[PDB]
Structure formats: structure tokens, C-alpha cells
Write a protein that binds this ligand. Structure first.
Ligand SMILES: CC(=O)N[C@H]1[C@H]([C@H](O)[C@H](O)CO)O[C@@](OC[C@H]2O[C@@H](O)[C@H](O)[C@@H](O)[C@H]2O)(C(=O)O)C[C@@H]1O
Ligand SMILES: CC(=O)N[C@H]1[C@H]([C@H](O)[C@H](O)CO)O[C@@](OC[C@H]2O[C@@H](O)[C@H](O)[C@@H](O)[C@H]2O)(C(=O)O)C[C@@H]1O
Ligand SMILES: CC(=O)N[C@H]1[C@H]([C@H](O)[C@H](O)CO)O[C@@](OC[C@H]2O[C@@H](O)[C@H](O)[C@@H](O)[C@H]2O)(C(=O)O)C[C@@H]1O
Ligand SMILES: *[C@@H]1O[C@H](CO)[C@@H](O[C@@H]2O[C@H](CO)[C@@H](O)[C@H](O)[C@H]2NC(C)=O)[C@H](O)[C@H]1NC(C)=O
Ligand SMILES: *[C@@H]1O[C@H](CO)[C@@H](O[C@@H]2O[C@H](CO)[C@@H](O)[C@H](O)[C@H]2NC(C)=O)[C@H](O)[C@H]1NC(C)=O
Ligand SMILES: *[C@@H]1O[C@H](CO)[C@@H](O[C@@H]2O[C@H](CO)[C@@H](O)[C@H](O)[C@H]2NC(C)=O)[C@H](O)[C@H]1NC(C)=O
Ligand SMILES: *[C@@H]1O[C@H](CO)[C@@H](O)[C@H](O)[C@H]1NC(C)=O
Ligand SMILES: *[C@@H]1O[C@H](CO)[C@@H](O)[C@H](O)[C@H]1NC(C)=O
Ligand SMILES: *[C@@H]1O[C@H](CO)[C@@H](O)[C@H](O)[C@H]1NC(C)=O
Ligand SMILES: *[C@@H]1O[C@H](CO)[C@@H](O)[C@H](O)[C@H]1NC(C)=O
Ligand SMILES: *[C@@H]1O[C@H](CO)[C@@H](O)[C@H](O)[C@H]1NC(C)=O
Ligand SMILES: *[C@@H]1O[C@H](CO)[C@@H](O)[C@H](O)[C@H]1NC(C)=O
Lengths: 170, 316, 316, 170, 316, 170
């Protein structure tokens, strides 16, 4: 991807995360736990959904027969028709290949972007109370229990409360 | 001590192509190219006419196999390979143009030309057109000399389209299998048939001669047509060898015409048809039949083009 | 104590569509599809010929309404619905091909064929072609027997294109309203007209008979044409019923031909024309008329496709 | 957007910013003030301008009449012509829809990118003298007056001067 | 004390265009539009037939210049500007359709029609078709009355295609330079030629008259053709003026036909051909010839469209 | 670019870097040196390579002659053919222009992205032992010799070893 998170600094995904697209996995004195992020997951899903709504349709444009499979049309007009149809086949096959390749590049980068954004949101929440590991993890210096973890996830975390401790524990 | 951000992944991802890369695996994907055909003409909710043994152009002239289709009404018209436009052998000039007109016609309504005759026979028949005995095209009259070898009088007949819509007018030129046979039917001499309207002008001289036997006949009929505009008049000046229209045809409205080898099915609905059936799909592309008609996904050469609907799959 | 980064926004944004989303509001946007028509033919700076009552093909033969258009010169040629190519009723074979040739011709220059005649009349006229009394096509001659019922002598006339460019040659076949009328004009017998060049060969036998009266006449004239290449010779062998060309036509250069129902306007310039007028625009697409011609934006089905020219609008 | 700034961590835009596209809003002992950034605004405007120059034109490609509205061409050739024109209408309507949707995605992401870049430029200017708020704001620990603010905007700010103070004031 | 990240750059970058910008310089780029033509027909590995002075349609009838091409076999067929289909002047009806059929034919195989004759001459010849003395089309027979002015007997000849593939059948109508000349060859009267199969019906009456001399002749031959389906029979009923086929033609398989002014070259291979030669390229687009045929890059109007293959070039 | 590195906060490229696309230039007591990064270079090259493999081909779609350069086809059918071919020329010229412009935008952003990613990888390696300059440079507080530099390049650098020193040397 363009944002270097998915298949980037995050080494791999989690099969156990069955609840969403992006999520949190923590480590504290109480043990290890995992949870899905609703907002990030929803933003990616809604955008992919929007692509499908645009792409998955056909036109209300009617075409009729201009040649004949039972008794052949005159050769000259028939060859013009076939040349024209073949040309259209060439244009549409090109359009379809390019459409799908382009959408797929964007779709993959879109998911990578949403991951990076979540990562940065947490980073900004934590201030001087944590430091980046580099593998997609934030080492927190002060003690952080399941409420403290839940507050990080719910974006209700108050950095100033634990600031003195983590600042000293640097 | 710490918290880690991540994303989901699966064991079995799906391969897709990108701008930079072929076969990148993603968490999920979905097909954009339709490959599933329904092997039936899905005609639910549509007034459908399956012509069977009647050829589309025969609905205008009326060989015996088209007797039930002289005045049909339709949204969808189905032509079949076994369809024949003729009983007594012959063909139409500008035949495919006329088929295209009839396919989108909505069907046809028939009205008398008002032609009456004196000094000639009016009931020519043949073993090639069977209706419990010899007969002829239901919508036409085989005009003949009163008796063997008698001169056919120089005749004029005119018809004025008094309707709001253009009238489809058809006539025929009869080419006997020999010159003697032509003289026997219409008297000797080189006969002439003239036809003109206010935007159409043409003439016809027959041409007797031995053709190979078709439906038991070495003769042929040339069928010709024209669209006669509202208030326009058509005049037929003829000296023999002329197959007269008994009725004019009018187009009913709008329809779509298809060619097919499969059965009609009123249990499924679809708007994209081809000879092998119906393409029912919301996908933008199809790889089934490049000659599909109606409202169709675009035909493309690729069998498959997968659209990613998830992130890149990165398993451990 | 602090500093904050931000971006602008507005009260009333404009909706646009994206790959992922319909109706996202942005700070500003601009239309890509043209909907504004100018209801005039914008002909500023162009040599324009508005044919009015003269039909394009009549510029070659010269019925009275085309008298002022026999040798016109043009960048832009305008055909009108009221235009007629004929005075004495008839039509051209391969008519639309000839119109397409004349539309891009730049106009026409006329030159004598050098034909002279003996043993026949040369001045056939009719009440259908009015020039203060009965007259005929200005560029043609109605060739007739010297007197009623006299035999028309078997004739040969040839013309050699000595010019650098191909010559447009036209002739006519006259179909009288009856056989008696044909014999009266050109003597009895089945007349023949032969025409050949070094790359063209064809023959014509007339066909008298009663047509419906058009411009007071039950007769018709078949007009025919061919392009005679530089140094090539055309030969006319004919026995009557023949409308002789008096002059050949040469194409002047390049032009564009249009059909329209609106007035010419030398106050506006435009290069995209249709029957309703002129599309003046720099936009890449238009939703006005799919049959527009000249140098045009591409026709599309959508009325509107807005292109974002600002960031996403995020008001408080 | 892909960069999560516009309609992202910056909660909303400013109607009062009538002078440019991106800008600064400060808070110090002297009060509150606002100013437009020229470089960021210009970079976005020039790129949008470039798109319009490419898109807003039609071809010098001439087409002539091939059918006739006054006296109809022959039916068979007429139907071939109509089928061909309708096919072209279908290709161009698809091209136009896709062109505009794609340009609009890119245009929106382009503006988001330019905002993010400005944000990061300021962050790097400030070093250890400030900390990220998370709402698109930099809390500065040392006293920063209207010259100090103007220096940040003009990119003439010297972090080393105020380093000792803010470092202690952490 | 420190470490710095950076990227490479060059002195001389290459300009490319983007969505937002024209002429952005990048580290490297590569062309997508082909401009290099090879001025030869690159025919390596292909069975090639260069018709030279033989016209494609002459391979069917057999004027002297086509004597070596009566039964050719080919993957690639080359037509030349100097090619002529005729010796005795004339032309084919539906000529371009027949050329298109022959171009993709794979070549032709010939078989006798099995026609034998009594009561007439069979060996008409002319100085226009030279084979060490006067001769005629190798595949045809000029059928004549036994002696000057004698009546040509009303004749019938039929041929049944007993093969698995359709048969190409050709015949000719002879138009003498005068009526006297026609009577001398085939006796007096208005001759008739009738031709019919089970899906084809048409008639022909000649038309003598003075044409300009081509290859020393004022006469012409109308050549006509039809595809006779497996098991179908064609019947020729004729009264004179008829050029009889001696042999039927069958298509061998598949080929591609081109028109060119350049020499064949068996040292290069290519699949995209035009009159000026061969476009050998893997690039997706070409600006060389919009009428190129075979398997070709797409023709575009732009001379050049550079694709970036490196980052933006930012030199000091 | 969208990531503001190339032709962005990195002021210019290096002509001397002939060994790769992205690289390191260091400054220590031992002097100055320069080296190419293999992974970043390879990732960009493979992606550009993939674009060329997709684009540089023509179809296996055969077209035959439908008109004639030696003896002209009938005028009406000829004009229909020319109109159709000209329409196709218009579609393909548009497709080609748009394809190349779009690929080039993406190609340029792709290279900018790969640079930004490398920059961020190093940043995360260094933790509290360095600080961003803003010109694409990391000022390291502790002494870092050619092994220490080589460890940064090879991603074998242990921040904890030099942490105490640089933390104090802040
Ligand atoms: C109007 C008329 O004359 N009808 C005849 C018809 C025509 O003369 C003829 O078709 C014109 O070409 O001929 C009919 O007999 C011909 C046909 O009869 C079969 O029974 C027989 O097996 C055949 O070999 C042949 O003789 C006809 O049936 O069409 C009689 C009809 O009344
Ligand atoms: C060259 C010639 O003979 N001109 C005649 C012309 C032709 O004979 C005729 O058009 C060939 O079809 O006929 C003209 O009279 C016919 C016409 O005259 C009107 O006045 C009258 O109202 C009509 O009913 C009809 O009789 C003609 O005007 O064309 C005379 C012309 O001199
Ligand atoms: C079958 C036959 O009659 N062949 C004649 C031929 C035909 O009569 C004629 O081509 C039909 O249109 O005419 C030939 O002589 C005509 C030709 O002879 C030249 O030598 C002379 O220079 C010309 O002016 C002209 O007289 C012919 O050669 O075609 C004789 C041939 O046997
Ligand atoms: C135009 O293309 C069609 C196919 O799309 C050709 O028709 C096919 O011809 C092959 C070989 O003769 C047959 O096996 C198929 O049954 C035909 N398919 C269909 C759908 O008809 C057709 O011949 C081409 N037209 C011309 C004028 O050559
Ligand atoms: C091809 O399409 C045109 C329209 O684009 C058809 O012409 C229209 O026909 C309708 C119904 O008869 C009329 O109401 C309009 O006035 C016509 N419009 C124009 C611009 O001519 C035309 O009939 C179609 N061609 C064929 C051969 O069917
Ligand atoms: C269709 O276009 C072709 C060109 O693509 C026209 O043919 C050219 O005509 C010009 C001017 O007469 C000549 O100089 C060229 O030699 C021709 N080029 C080729 C390749 O033949 C052609 O006339 C157009 N068709 C019609 C019917 O007008
Ligand atoms: C994956 O995509 C398919 C469409 O091809 C769909 O049926 C399915 O619901 C999707 N699976 C999940 C888990 O979303
Ligand atoms: C046809 O003629 C009738 C008069 O009987 C008239 O009402 C109608 O307007 C005419 N229609 C046209 C199209 O001229
Ligand atoms: C917004 O766009 C329109 C074009 O549709 C333009 O006329 C106008 O100048 C733009 N407004 C501003 C404030 O830039
Ligand atoms: C036409 O003939 C003249 C001789 O009068 C000659 O100058 C010219 O070259 C010829 N043109 C062509 C195309 O043969
Ligand atoms: C630059 O691109 C060209 C293709 O146009 C290629 O021949 C060459 O190898 C490339 N140069 C480098 C240094 O990669
Ligand atoms: C043609 O006739 C032969 C009988 O001689 C037969 O074997 C074959 O099936 C027939 N072919 C067709 C297509 O009817």
C-alpha cells in the first residue's frame, strides 16, 4: 500500500479478529485481550460498499439486432457490422480491465490508509505517556488496566491523569 | 505495559489484479463478468409471440404456417430457425430491412386495400400452399387471364393511405418456370409492372426460365414492399405476372425481436437475450454472447475480472 | 500557548460524485456537460450558403428554385426542410451518397459538355418547371423526336474530362405516364439507354405507366450520376426517353454541410452545429443533440457531471 | 480523504478564513488571530487548475452527417448507423462518468494531502518546544508572542532559542 | 551526530504529463506510441502470395496475368496497385464483397462444372486476352451461335454442389459494342439469362451499345457471382450473351488479405500490416497508419505519450 | 507528490547516489558517507515494472480490411466506415492520454510514498535517541560510528543500548 501499514510496519494481520477489520490487542498485568474498532471498520466498509453501488449495474440502453444468424446478411454490410462489433468488444474489454485494476489499487490503498489513520489517532491520544515500538505497538510506561485500555479504545482516555508517572518512568 | 493496532486476515484469500501487480491476494473479492446463462427465453410479464414455423416476413403475405400470425400483437417477437416466409418459393427484396421493421413493430394490424377486379381471374392457387387442398398466400391474390393464353388487360389500381401512420404495402412478381407457362397464364408479350408513390418509383419486367424445384415448383415469386405515408397514394400499373396485395399492414407500436433456439419461460424475467437464452445479471460485463440484445451487460473477452472488496490479505 | 492548523469552508457547498460516494459536498465545482444551446446557426467568418427552397441535389440539375445556386461557393452549406431537388417529379439513384459528396464539396463550378444535336428536338418543357411560362431543368435538355410519333434515331454522345479533378456527370431517364405518351415523344419500340466509362458500366430501359400526379405530372424522371476521372471518357448511347446533361459539375474544395430549422447569425462563431442550432462550448461533453456535427463536445446521456474544484466542505 | 486531516482529525473548516485554503489560528497572551498560508493554498490551486486545463477542451476532430433528418436513409444502413452511434453514446457516457468520479476522488485526496503536509511541516519546525493536541493544534510550552507566531507562519522560527524553556516547562 | 535520508536524481530528466500537470520531469520514461515503420511486408514463416499484376478477382476468372494464381494457397495475400482483374474489359457486381471473401479464403481450389454443349460454338476469343495469339478467360467459356447471325437455342445447364463447403460460382453477361454485333454473335431478339438456386433468384437482359474503348474493346462483360450451398443446385437458363463458368471455386481455409506498395521480406516477422509496410512493436498504441490491419497496436492521433518509469527528478 | 517528501521536505535528490533509488547519507566523527537502500529501491522498481508488464502489449484481436485504397468502395458505405473509424480514433486517443496521465500521477506518488515510508521506518528505529531536523535528517545525540550507522541501515540498531546517553544528552 501507499501508507506502509498493512503489509508494512504491521508485519501481519490477525485471523482471530472476526469482529471487525481493524482492532486493538493489548498487554497488561491483567493479561492479553483483543477488540475491533467500529469507526475505522465502518469507514472502510462504507467506501467499498459505495464502489459496488456505482459499478454493479448495467445500462437502461437498448440495442436491437442488426444482423442475422439464420439467414446471413449481405457480405459487405456484414463485414462492416462485424468490424464495428469487434472494435466495441476491444474498447469494452480494455475499459473493464482498466476499471478493475484501478479500483483494486485504490481499494487496497484505502484500507491501508484507514489503518494508518487509526494508528495515528491513538498516537495523538497517548502524547508523552507512550512510545512507538515500530511493529504497530505503543509501549505505555505507566500502569494501564482494562478500564485504561477501554478508555483508549473508546477515545475517552485522559493523558494528563497518568502524565506525571509516565513522564518520570521514561 | 502496551497496546497494539492491527487488522484482520484470513487463511484463504482471493487473487485480484492491480495497476502494479497480478494476483495480489485480498480478504474478499467479487466477480464483475457474468458467465452464467439461463438456457430459456425469460419472458415473464411480456406479451410474447413465438413464430415457430412462421417466418417473420410471412406474417405479411400469409403462407399457411403463418395463418395464426396475420394480425399479432407483441412486446417480444421470437424468430426460430425452422421459420419459413414462403409456401410458393420466392423471396423479398430488401428482406433484412423489412425484418428489422417488423421486429420493432409491436406487431401488425391488417386492412383491406379495397381492390376489385373485372376481366381477369383472381383465384390462382398451388399445391405448394396447402389448406386442405391447393391455396395461396392469405393476404395476396394471384391475378390471372380469364382463360389459357388470353391477353391480360393493361390495368391500373390505386390505394390511398387515409390513416395517421405509414402503410406497409407488398406485392409480388411471378416468374414462371418457362416462357410458354408465362404466356399460358398472362398472354404473350413482354409484360411490365409499374409502381409509384410520391416518394418511390420503380418498374419490373418478369423473367421466366427454369429454376431448380423448391416445394415442388420451378417458378418463383419476387416479393417487393414500400412504406406508404399518410395521405400518399400508390398506383400499380401492370400487364400480368403480378401478385396483388389484398391487404395493407400497419405497425402497432413498439417491440423487440430476437432469434433463439430455446424454450420460452414465464417464470423468469430478463431483458438481455441471445440465441442460447437469457442473461440475468446486475454485473456490468458479460462473457456469454457478443451478439446479445436488449438491455445487456457489456460483452468483454475476459472470462473473469475480480473486484477487491477487502484489504490485502496478510496471514502469518 | 498554542497554534492551530485548519482549512476554509463555506455555508453552501456543491455536491459531486466520487469513486466511493454519491453527493459528497465540496467547496466549489464546475460543470463538464454542456446543456446551453444557441438557437441559431452561428456562421461568423464563414462563407455560408443557405439553400432555402433549393434542394442540394437541385444545384446540379437546376429546377427554378435553384437558379441562384448553380455555381455556388461555400465553407458551410445549409439544407432546409422546405428544400426540393425537383420541379418535374423524379428522384436520384444513390441520392444520399451524392448529397454527402456535395455537402463537403466547397460548392460547384459548371462547364459545358459540348454536346450538339441534329435530327431531334432539344427544348422539351413542362408546366411543372415555371420560369414565366413552361421551362425545364436549367442544366439539362429534354431530347425529343422532331415531331409527334417519329422514331428517335439511335444516338451516341461522348464527353472527355480534360480537367485535373473528377467530373460529376448527371443524366435522366424519362418515364411517361403511359405507353402512348412515350411513343408520341420518342417513337414506338422498347428504347434503350447505355452509359459507360472506363470504370463504370450500366444500362437503362424506361418504363411508362400511370403514377399519381405530383406537381401536376403522372410522369417521372430517373436522375443518375457518375464521377468521371481525369482523362476518362463517358459515352451515352440512347434511343429516346433520355434527359441529356448540358453541363458537367466540378467540386471547388472543402466544406461542411448541415441540416437546420433556425436562422443564420453572423454575430456568433461556432463549429458544432445541429438542427436546433449551434453548441458553443469548451466543455468536453454535451447533452443537447447526439447528431451534432462539426467539431463538437462528445454527446453523453447524463444531464450533468460536476467536477470538484475545491476540497471537501466541512462546515461546523 | 486518504490523509485523515480534512474531515478527519481536524474536526471542521473555518468560514472566517476567506484569504486562502489553509491557514493558522493562534492563541497567546495577546489574544487570538488567524492567517492564510500562501504556499499550501497555491500548491492545491495550481494542481486543480492543471486538471481543468487538461479537461476543459473539445477535439479538433471533425465529423460530418452520415444520415438525414429530412429524407430518411435506407432502413438497413440507417439501423447500422443508429446502432453505431448508440454504442458510441454508451462508451462516452461511461468514460465521462468514470473520468469525473476518478478526478473528484483524487481532487479531494489532493486537498487533504496538502493540509496534512502543512501540519507536518509545522510539527517539524517546533521540535521539542510543542506537543500535538490531536485536534490539529500544537500546544507550545514557552511564551510565544505575535512575532513568535509570525515566525512560525513565515518558517523563520528558531526552535533552539526557546528550547531551554519549553524543555523545562514540559 | 546525524543521518539523512534521500533519493537519486539526474542532470537530464524526461518530461511527462500527469493529471494535474504538463511537462513534469522524471528520472526516466518510456514511449507508449509507436512511430517506427518497417517499409517491407514482413512475411517470415507465412505462406505468402503476392498477386503482382493479377487482380484478386481475376484468380476466379483467369485473365492471362492470373494464369499462375488459379489455385493458390495462402496465409497472407498481397494485392498490388498494378493488379487487374480483367483482360476483356468488364467488372464484377458486388465486387468488394467478393474481394473480402477471397482475402480471408486461404486461397482457392478449382473443380469442373461438368458442363458440355451441343448446337453452339464454345471457343470465343479476343485480342484483349493474349496467350501467344487471341484467347479468353481461362476459367470461362465464351458461348456463341454456330455461325454468324444464327439463333442461339434456349439452353438450360445445372450444377449441383456435391461438396461439404459452399461453392463460388461465377458467370458473365456480354454487352456487345452494338446491336448488330450482338445479333451477329447470338442471333436477333432480346436475349434473356436466368439464374436461380434455392436461396438466390435473379435475371439479366443484355444491353448492347457503344462504350469507350478499353484494352481495344468497346464491348463489356458483366461478371456475377453466388455462393452455392452444399447439396444446392444452380440452374442457368440463357438465350445468348452468356459467358459460362467452366469451373467452380472452393475456399481452402483461412487467410488475411492486404494492400501494399512495398516489397516482401522473409527476414522479419510481423502481424500488423499497412500499405507502407509492417508495424513491429509491443507498444499498445501507434501513430503510423489508421488503416493498419492484422493484430495491431491501437491507432491514436498523438505522436508521443511518455510513461514515467521513475520518480520526479529534483536536481540541485 | 501526495506524501510531501520527494520535491517536498527533502529539498532535492542526489546525483551521486548511483547505486539505488533511495539512500542514506550520514555525518559522524569518522566523516561523511552514502549508501543505497535495497528494500525501498526494490519495492518501487518492482511496482513500476508491474505497470510496464500490464501496459506494454497489444491484443491478439485481428482486424481485416473493410475498405479499399486502390479502387474506392461505394460512397455511402465508405462514409459510414470513415465515420466509424474516426470515432474509434477519438475513443482510443482519449483512452491513451488518460491512461498515461493517470499512470504517471500514480507512479510519481508511488515513489514519494516509498521515500516517506523509509523515512518513517528510520524514525521509529531511533525512538528518543534522535530528533527530526525537518530537511529529511535525524540528529543523533549519542556518538554513532560506522557500525552504529551500518546497524541503522541494516535495521539491526538497538536503541536501548544508547538510550541512557541520548536521553541525558537531550
Ligand atoms: C394459377 C395457376 O396457374 N396455378 C397452377 C400452377 C402454376 O401454373 C405454376 O405454379 C406457375 O409456375 O401450377 C400448379 O401445378 C404445377 C405443379 O403441380 C404439381 O401437382 C406437380 O406435382 C408439379 O410437378 C407441377 O406440375 C401448382 O400446383 O402450382 C397448378 C396450379 O393450379
Ligand atoms: C416535352 C413535352 O412533351 N412536354 C409536354 C409534357 C410532356 O408530354 C409530359 O409531361 C410527359 O409526361 O406535358 C405537358 O402537359 C401535360 C400537363 O399539362 C398541364 O397543363 C395539365 O394541367 C396537365 O393535366 C397535363 O396535361 C406539361 O406541361 O408537362 C406539356 C409539355 O409541353
Ligand atoms: C467471340 C468473338 O466474336 N470474338 C471476336 C471479338 C468479338 O466479336 C467482340 O470483341 C465482341 O465485342 O472481336 C474481335 O475483334 C474486335 C477487335 O479486333 C482488333 O484486332 C481490332 O484492333 C479492334 O479494332 C476490334 O476490331 C476481338 O479481337 O475481340 C475478334 C474476336 O474473334
Ligand atoms: C460475422 O461474425 C459472425 C460470428 O460472430 C460470423 O458467423 C459465424 O460464422 C461461423 C463460420 O462460418 C459459424 O460457425 C457460426 O455459426 C457463425 N456465428 C453466428 C453467430 O452467426 C459471420 O459469418 C461474420 N459475418 C460475415 C459477413 O463474414
Ligand atoms: C435512427 O434514430 C433516429 C433518431 O435518432 C430516428 O429518427 C427519429 O424517429 C422518430 C420516430 O420515428 C421521430 O419522432 C424523430 O423525428 C426522428 N429523429 C430524427 C433526428 O430524425 C430514426 O428513425 C432511426 N433510424 C432508423 C433507420 O430507424
Ligand atoms: C475515407 O478516408 C480516406 C482516408 O482515410 C479517404 O481516402 C483518401 O482520400 C484522399 C483525398 O481524396 C487521398 O489523397 C488519399 O490518397 C486517400 N487515402 C486512402 C488511404 O485511401 C476516402 O476518400 C474517404 N472515403 C470516402 C468515401 O470519402
Ligand atoms: C465476500 O464476497 C462475496 C461476493 O463475491 C459475498 O457473497 C460474501 O458475503 C463476502 N463475504 C464476507 C465475509 O463478507
Ligand atoms: C391528411 O389529410 C387529411 C384530410 O383528409 C388532413 O386532416 C390531415 O391534416 C392530412 N395529414 C397530413 C400529414 O397532411
Ligand atoms: C467556483 O466555480 C465556478 C465555476 O463553476 C466559478 O465561476 C467561480 O469563480 C468559482 N468560485 C470561486 C470562489 O472560486
Ligand atoms: C491526362 O492527359 C494529359 C495529356 O493531355 C497529361 O498531361 C496528363 O498527365 C494526364 N493525366 C493523368 C492522370 O494521366
Ligand atoms: C530508461 O528507460 C529506457 C526506455 O525508454 C530504457 O532503455 C533504459 O534502460 C532506462 N534507463 C535506466 C537507467 O534504467
Ligand atoms: C448432402 O447430401 C448427402 C447425400 O448425398 C448427405 O450425406 C448429407 O447429409 C447432405 N448434407 C446436408 C447438409 O444436408
Amino acid at each position: 500500500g501507499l501508507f506502509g501499514a498493512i503489509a508494512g510496519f504491521i508485519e501481519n494481520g490477525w485471523e482471530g479478529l472476526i469482529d471487525g477489520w481493524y482492532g486493538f490487542r493489548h498487554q497488561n498485568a491483567q493479561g492479553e485481550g483483543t477488540a475491533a474498532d467500529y469507526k475505522s471498520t465502518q469507514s472502510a466498509i462504507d467506501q467499498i460498499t459505495g464502489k459496488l453501488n456505482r459499478l454493479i449495474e448495467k445500462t437502461n440502453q437498448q440495442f436491437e439486432l442488426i444482423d442475422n444468424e439464420f439467414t446471413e446478411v449481405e457480405k459487405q454490410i456484414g463485414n462492416v457490422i462485424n468490424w464495428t462489433r469487434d472494435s466495441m468488444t476491444e474498447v469494452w474489454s480494455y475499459n473493464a480491465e482498466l476499471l478493475v485494476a484501478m479500483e483494486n489499487q485504490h481499494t487496497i490503498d484505502l484500507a491501508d490508509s484507514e489503518m494508518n489513520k487509526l494508528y495515528e489517532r491513538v498516537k495523538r491520544q497517548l502524547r508523552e505517556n507512550a512510545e512507538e515500538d515500530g511493529t504497530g505497538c505503543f509501549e505505555i510506561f505507566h500502569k494501564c488496566d482494562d478500564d485504561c485500555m477501554a478508555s483508549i479504545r473508546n477515545n475517552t482516555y485522559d493523558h494528563s491523569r497518568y502524565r506525571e508517572e509516565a513522564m518520570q518512568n521514561r | 505495559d502496551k497496546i497494539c493496532l492491527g487488522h484482520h486476515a484470513v487463511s484463504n484469500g482471493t487473487k485480484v489484479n492491480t495497476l502494479t501487480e497480478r494476483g495480489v491476494e485480498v480478504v474478499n473479492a467479487t466477480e464483475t463478468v457474468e458467465r452464467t446463462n439461463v438456457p430459456r427465453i425469460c419472458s415473464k410479464g411480456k406479451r410474447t409471440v413465438d413464430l415457430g414455423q412462421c417466418g417473420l416476413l410471412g406474417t405479411i403475405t400469409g403462407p399457411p404456417q403463418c395463418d395464426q400470425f396475420l394480425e399479432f400483437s407483441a412486446d417480444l417477437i421470437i424468430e426460430r430457425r425452422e421459420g419459413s416466409d414462403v409456401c410458393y418459393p420466392g423471396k423479398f427484396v430488401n428482406e433484412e430491412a423489412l425484418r428489422q421493421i417488423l421486429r420493432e413493430s409491436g406487431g401488425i394490424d391488417k386492412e383491406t386495400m379495397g381492390f376489385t377486379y373485372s376481366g381477369i381471374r383472381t383465384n390462382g392457387a398451388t399445391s405448394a400452399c396447402r389448406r386442405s387442398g391447393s391455396s395461396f398466400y392469405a393476404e395476396m391474390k394471384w391475378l390471372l387471364s380469364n382463360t389459357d393464353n388470353a391477353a391480360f388487360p393493361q390495368m391500373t389500381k390505386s390505394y390511398k393511405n387515409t390513416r395517421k401512420d405509414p402503410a406497409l404495402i407488398i406485392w409480388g412478381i411471378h416468374h414462371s418456370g418457362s416462357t410458354t407457362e408465362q404466356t399460358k397464364l398472362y398472354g404473350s408479350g413482354n409484360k411490365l409492372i409499374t409502381v409509384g408513390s410520391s416518394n418511390y418509383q420503380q418498374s419490373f419486367v418478369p423473367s421466366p426460365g427454369a429454376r431448380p424445384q423448391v416445394n415442388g415448383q420451378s417458378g418463383r415469386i419476387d416479393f417487393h414492399w414500400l412504406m406508404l405515408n399518410p395521405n400518399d397514394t400508390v398506383t400499380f400499373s401492370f400487364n400480368g405476372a403480378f401478385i396483388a396485395p389484398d391487404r395493407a399492414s400497419f405497425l402497432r407500436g413498439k417491440s423487440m425481436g430476437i432469434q433463439s433456439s430455446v424454450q420460452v419461460d414465464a417464470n423468469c424475467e430478463g431483458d438481455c437475450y441471445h440465441s442460447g437464452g437469457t442473461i440475468i445479471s446486475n454485473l456490468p460485463f458479460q462473457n456469454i454472447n457478443s451478439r446479445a440484445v436488449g438491455k445487456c451487460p457489456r460483452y468483454v473477452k475476459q472470462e473473469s475480472l475480480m473486484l477487491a472488496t477487502g484489504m490485502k490479505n496478510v496471514p502469518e
